Write a protein that binds this ligand. Structure first.
Ligand SMILES: CCNC(=O)C#Cc1ccc2c(c1)NC(=O)/C2=C(\Nc1ccc(CN(C)C)cc1)c1ccccc1
Lengths: 264, 22
């Protein structure tokens, strides 16, 4: 493959380590996203090994709620990633625009997320950075896990995002796949509320609220959503509701309107 | 646009990407 095998339609925006373009593969007239990475830039920033780990994980994952990497090619100066195009774009922009999601929208995303994470966990892949900014939306608004920047095939690596950090990470303990259970609970809360649960003016007060699980549910939340969130946001990782438990949760069953995209 | 219709058609009639690209 070469860039000449594609018609670049338009830029989609800045992605991690490079610009993303909407492109059509001339032969099959197939619309996809094309991420362009500059080989020298990757070397200068010292992110080659970090990009290789992400490509290695994302290219071997095949799930309707995981953004697909079809293939990759390179020339003298650039590495091109042939990626699934998610037509509805950034989930965070949608959250920002609406302020908060309704129960249907949130439960659908939770079912899609738990299914994608279960698929990962089954393959010993821990995401470690589930948050709205790492999610894209498909043609029918279906969730697409799009960033695997902190992911690992398995830990002590202190990683993720402040508001989403599990207690065990803040406390410098070893962690396992159960960090994704905690982040799923923080995500569910943020979807429904519009803000993460332990939001505070200072890092020390956010750390304090996380370790004490200082969860203060707004009165507009249903009993069902609070039930799911409380079951995920457990201080002790083994007490956290498993991903199969999220999928089976009565609030998810009653509210999700998940549709599986057509297969070939 | 004509692009919007092609994106729609791609969702409903997906291609074997594993064979075409993989
Ligand atoms: C393992 C390594 N993998 C990767 O590095 C990767 C990736 C990746 C990154 C981003 C995209 C992608 C794949 N596919 C997409 O469709 C992407 C974007 N879609 C997108 C943007 C705007 C609109 C237009 N809005 C207005 C609806 C729609 C759709 C997107 C691009 C740039 C910035 C934010 C989002």
């Amino acid at each position: 493959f070469t860039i000449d095998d594609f018609d670049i339609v338009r830029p989609l925006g800045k992605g991690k380590f490079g610009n993303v373009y909407l492109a059509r593969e001339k032969q099959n007239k197939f619309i996809m996203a094309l991420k362009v990475l500059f080989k020298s830039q990757l070397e200068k920033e010292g992110v080659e090994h970090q990009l290789r780990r992400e490509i290695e994980i994302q290219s071997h994952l095949r799930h309707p709620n995981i953004l697909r990497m079809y293939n990759y090619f390179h020339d003298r100066k650039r590495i091109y990633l042939m990626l699934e195009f998610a037509p509805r774009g950034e989930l965070y922009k949608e959250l920002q625009k609406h302020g908060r999601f309704d129960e249907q929208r949130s439960a659908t995303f939770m079912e899609e997320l738990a299914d994608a994470l279960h698929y990962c966990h089954e393959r010993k892949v821990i995401h470690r950075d589930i948050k709205p900014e790492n999610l894209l939306m498909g043609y029918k608004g279906e969730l697409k896990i799009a960033d695997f920047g902190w992911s690992v095939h398995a830990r002590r690596t202190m990683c993720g995002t402040l508001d989403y950090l599990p207690p065990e990470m803040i406390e410098g303990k070893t962690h396992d796949e159960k960090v994704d259970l905690w982040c799923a609970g923080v995500l569910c809360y943020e979807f429904l509320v519009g803000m993460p649960p332990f939001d505070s003016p200072s890092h020390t007060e956010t750390h304090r609220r996380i370790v004490n699980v200082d969860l203060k549910f707004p009165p507009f939340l249903s009993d069902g959503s609070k039930d799911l969130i409380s079951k995920l946001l457990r201080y002790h990782p083994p007490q956290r509701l498993p991903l199969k438990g999220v999928m089976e949760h009565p609030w998810v069953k009653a509210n999700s309107r998940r549709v599986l995209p057509p297969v070939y | 646009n004509l692009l919007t219709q092609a994106i729609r058609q791609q969702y409903y009639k997906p291609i074997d990407v594993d064979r075409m690209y993989g």
